[PDB]
Amino acid sequence: TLPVKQVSLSRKTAYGNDWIYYSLEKGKEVSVSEESHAENTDWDIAFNRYNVRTNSGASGKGKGGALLTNIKDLAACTTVPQGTFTVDAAYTITAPGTGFPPPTMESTANEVLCKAITFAGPPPTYTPSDYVFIVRTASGKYAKLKAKSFYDDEGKSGIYSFEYAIQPDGSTNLN
Question: Which UniProt keywords apply (predicted)?
Fold first, then answer.
């Protein structure tokens, strides 16, 4: 069976285009300039608050994308289900600065993975999806991924946690 990696991002992001770039293939945060991200295949997924990009569509030149499954157990996801992968397109994010309602800006992100964590409040509550997502990497490999938490170890919000397994052989076999 493929190994399952637990990931907690290294920091909370600012609002605006402060993205943490991650290689699912290599299992690490990667240095990727915001200026050049859309011409850079060193990243598979990227996080700004609980917004998520793939290396696809409006976000990048890769073969990336995402698919929501109706499977809840990562272990029970053994293959990529039938369905069209969603690629990245224009997405509204919180922008830097004072004011309520908060200032926003047009960015790019993935409609499927942006729902991997949902907010309700008060009190401020960040809820990971029960579901497995398929993530397609910049090279087009298939991974199975779940959101875990938006809370640090004190229970304060800002840190995106997830778990995934990646099939390095390029197949849709995710056992």
Answer: Lipoprotein
Q: Smallest Cα–Cα separation from 150: which of 12, 6, 18?
A: 12
Place of tokens 């053994």: 78
Resolution in A: 1.8
Of 30, 62, 57, nearest to 46 by C-alpha is 30
Query: Among 56, 51, 64, which residue's Cα sits nearest to residue 18?
Result: 51
Which sequence spans correspond to the domains of the chain?
A: 5-166
Let me know: does 71 contact 131? Beta carbons within 8 Å. yes
In angstroms, rounded to a whole number, what is the distance separating the alpha carbons of residues 17 and 30?
Answer: 16
Query: Strand pairing partners for 105?
Result: 93
**How is the beta sheet containing 20-23 ordered, strand by strand?**
28-30, 20-23, 45-48, 51-54
Exposure b/e, 8-23, CB count within 10 A at least 16 = b: ebeebbebbbebbbbb
Alpha-carbon separation of residue 12 from 9, 120, 157, 161 (angstroms): 8, 19, 8, 11
What are the start-end ranges of the E strands in the chain?
Answer: 5-8, 20-23, 28-30, 45-48, 51-54, 65-68, 89-94, 104-109, 117-120, 125-128, 133-136, 142-151, 157-166
